[PDB]
Symmetry: D2
Subunit: 342 residues, 4 copies
């Protein structure tokens, strides 16, 4: 039957990467894109990418007056800062991919529904009161009554699969997460006033290690309810343009033999071909650039310390392309979500 109609709000890093994957989807049709700039700018950003490859080498991208044309397919372009002004209704838009970073609450995203959209997927955490989905961990909780959902954050899609497998193997008592994270667009190019008042994100991104807060651990309860309230964590932003790593320091309680090898073997048993991969090579961050795993466990860094009485302090580490890993996960979730539309 008819392909599901998809609009993208915000043609940024995530939006353009989701475009690369949705545009090839036979079961979908990208009808419109909205941003804050003209078609030639959007076409050039789509064509050339500093970290994720030269898209123009395999595709023809051409800008029109009010549209872009990719491989013959014409997509209309809008420039509306307020979603209420978007014509989602006349375009019969089924799903809005909300990737602006400016509609991150169920109340804000509701504007898309008011404009005539049927469903909205927010490409970020967007509160404690909406469905937060990590594909292949809890995407099956989605129902027809969910109109606005969150695809969580890049760190949550990396932490969740790993935390779940560990917890299933040896119950987690508590854990502290540290993510060593590529710099992103919400940091400054050089020291300058940050619009949100964050004094550390105001510092030059490419020449600093920058401590930053993250809510990925504290909000793990939305994705893995048995871990609700057990994890806290934070981030260090460092000078790589993409590619990140999550380190979890957990206290686990178990009667089993808890060793580096038994830990690694459980992680390997929990791996799957789409979301959670298993690695034993000495890779570094540039090797995971562009991968489609949401999370890649690194068996080479597993550490274990026996505290006695069935208690252990354990370190498990996994890699993620904060751009493309998240995007591939968000896209899988979108493809599943579409069943509730058509």
């Amino acid at each position: 039957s008819m392909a599901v109609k998809v609009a993208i709000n915000g043609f940024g890093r995530i939006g353009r990467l989701a475009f690369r994957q949705m545009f090839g989807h036979e079961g979908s049709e990208i009808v419109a894109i909205n941003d804050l700039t003209d078609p030639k700018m959007l076409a050039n950003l789509l064509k050339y990418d500093s970290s994720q490859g030269n898209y123009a080498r395999n595709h023809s991208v051409v800008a029109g007056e009010d549209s872009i044309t990719v491989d013959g397919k014409t997509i209309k372009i809008y420039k509306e800062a307020d979603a209420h002004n978007l014509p989602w209704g006349e375009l019969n838009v089924d799903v809005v991919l909300e990737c602006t970073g400016f509609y991150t609450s169920k109340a804000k995203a509701q504007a898309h529904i008011d404009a005539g959209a049927k469903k909205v997927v927010i490409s970020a955490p967007a509160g404690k009161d909406l469905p937060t989905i990590v594909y292949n961990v809890n995407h099956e909780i989605l129902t027809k009554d969910d109109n606005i959902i969150s695809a969580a954050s890049c760190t949550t899609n990396c932490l969740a699969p790993m935390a779940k497998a560990l917890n299933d193997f040896a119950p987690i008592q508590s854990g502290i997460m540290s993510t060593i994270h590529a710099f992103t667009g919400d940091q400054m190019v050089l020291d300058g006033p940050h619009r949100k008042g964050d004094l550390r994100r105001a510092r030059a991104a490419a020449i600093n290690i920058v401590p930053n807060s993250t809510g990925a651990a504290k909000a793990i309860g939305l994705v893995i309810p048995e871990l609700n309230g057990k994890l806290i964590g934070s981030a260090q932003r460092v000078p790589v343009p993409t590619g990140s790593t999550t380190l979890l320091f957990a206290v686990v309680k178990s009667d089993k033999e808890i060793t580096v090898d038994s830990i690694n073997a459980a992680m390997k048993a929990a791996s799957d071909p789409e979301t959670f991969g298993y690695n034993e090579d000495p890779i570094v961050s540039s090797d995971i650039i562009g991968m489609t795993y949401g999370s890649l466990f690194d068996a080479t860094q597993t550490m274990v310390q026996d505290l006695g009485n069935g208690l252990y302090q354990v370190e498990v580490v996994s890699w993620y392309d904060n751009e493309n890993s998240y995007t591939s996960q968000m896209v899988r979730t979108i493809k599943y979500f579409e069943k509730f539309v058509a």
Copy 2:
């Protein structure tokens, strides 16, 4: 009595200017205006990723409506439109305009309307106002100049060098290429650029980025004898600060034009404040924080004989686009104060 000075735009240039003006006995920094709160401004002043840790030698404390630096209290305003600033009631003499949003005489007039007596713009600002490179043309300044430009970083590097070369062997024409540190007008990662520049939209720290520059084309404002003789462009590269200017000039002379005679002339033209002379194998991080507006690099001079008195010449000089420019702008401001 000390001259009352306000800073509009507490950015890279405004904060570096502050470091130097704050110590000037002949001036008093009365106010700062930007688009953020006092705590943000105090933190940016205390810690700098490329120009050093200012909090190590100074006390900076944020208040509700001010900052206090070394005991001295400075008022802080948050007005995007200069007409709303109380320059008149603060009896401000000179406004340092460092926002990048008032770069024309008509736009800068707002500061004077608000009650200031003089404005110095920290950028090129049209062809119709005094454009000043200290120790090249600052003496054209008169009492009737209310709004002036301190030109650009690249112009403050090129002018001393081009002038000295031209005085030695007249330039027929020249092409400038500047290898330039990335700046705040480029994006941290690939994204939509607000002014529609497709190259500036690219990630700053992992790309060589060609970009346009008007420094060579507008050199006539500073060195009238070179008017219309130079063109040029830029390459932005991944260093946070520190830049180099390469001039490829065809010169005509009956003299002996060699790498040595060229270098000896550059040295003869050097002076202790603006235009320095280097013969060491330095690299860009070595000039970070220097106070020369321009540092000629004798190690890179090249000369080719075209015959019949014509030569093609490459001369190179270094500049800290942040602090070299600032030191020049501050010299100009101190001179400008005589008219207040």
Copy 3:
């Protein structure tokens, strides 16, 4: 029967060449020699920081004395001296010399002594052997030439562009500046450089570093009509790969020399494999992994009339110093194989 090929030096160029030769039906990679063990060599082939994850599409496994790629077994040697290699008995036809330590006909002769029939050096290597830029002068090759040079990355960028300019409007003289990615001959942090270069001793990733280059001086080897007309130098900047060449030439012509007529000439000389033509606003990361030896950037062309048929002209082209060079060298090797 397929041509038997050995690689000496499994570095940036050696591994990138492997990537292109391994799929060639007319070739068979028989051996690899370096200064490390098979596991080290296998990991480097698998994962590359700037040229992509090779392990995503290929199977690479290290053995005790070999590596196996996609089922094919390749012997590995660890011999610092080329005389100790068993080239003769493995019946190696062509040796790809990519170590950087055999950069002369006399040194490269060792490979022939060890029993190989032909040697291609991945660098400039003297005046006493053929220096080849594919699609510029590769056709001078004969069967009686046993050792050839594939020139330098910069030469492979400069030559096609200089040739096209010169054919259009003869060059009187020129000065070249290349803005170049840092490479393995620079230090990771400031430290003693073994070859005594005071600038290559400085940290590669946080500096603009002037350095000398012989590409312009030796253009005569590839384009004899330009012999002695060009000089040049380089600026190493903090990108791991991707470079650009700027040529500032004085040209003499009776024709209409404009940015447009220059660009149109370049487009006319472009071709599908070696010399490409660009009019998009690209930056250096866009040309990573490209297979052109040279990509002319029409957006940066500049021209100044000096009067009397003289013009000063700026033409610019891009090149991936690693893979652009490699693609040219692989084209040269494949042509060279006809003589085997």
Copy 4:
């Protein structure tokens, strides 16, 4: 009396930074420098530094044929890869600062003593059989009978003060350390064969997050005997040229009130003006470049989780300039060690 005669073996990052500090110490005299290069190369590296500032702006440095002259004072230069060939004895060298990275054992460093030097301070870990010193943590165990000592590693000088204060406040059961570390000279500029066979240090330093092993946590027992065997850890090398941070994830046992505030207040009580500083501003790595603290506790990053029954999992974080923080600690140790000559 006579100034202590000091020789520097290895004019690298640490040797040159140490020179800057020692050269001004009146109680010392830098008599010789040995490396693998000529005076011209050494003089330029001392004048200009990509991360630690332009030294020539404040000093005159001039190269001769076999010497350098800094502010008028002439210093002899040697090029001897084997320490046995150095004329330490005839120059009456008291202390050798061993900063090459090639004499990191009591047995290798003994070569300097054989050459006629009286004492050696190695700028790295160098075994379990010699004194390993973190200033203001255990430097007072030094005796006149100690001829060869280790100044430990940069990470150890950051970890030791923090772990000690934590342990003194609430005893550590076990801990895992992660250090986010500036790239260093033992990584490659671009992907290439690493001489020591480390497949990760073989990768380009400035464009990768690179996992690496470290023995700092594992060997903390040499400096803090009560923590022996309780800590393990590793590192992530990232693309900043200098400036590092250490994260310690410790399980502690206590009957006291263990909170982020009680932890931070304990850390502050343990701070001192020279070695262990206390921070509450939102700094990032470039702010600590060139600082002289060996360790700078970051109170803004403290985390605590209650496990019940007196157990807590805690995160404490400290900053350090892996180059100049370590050098400053090593120089304080050298100045103290001089009492025994």
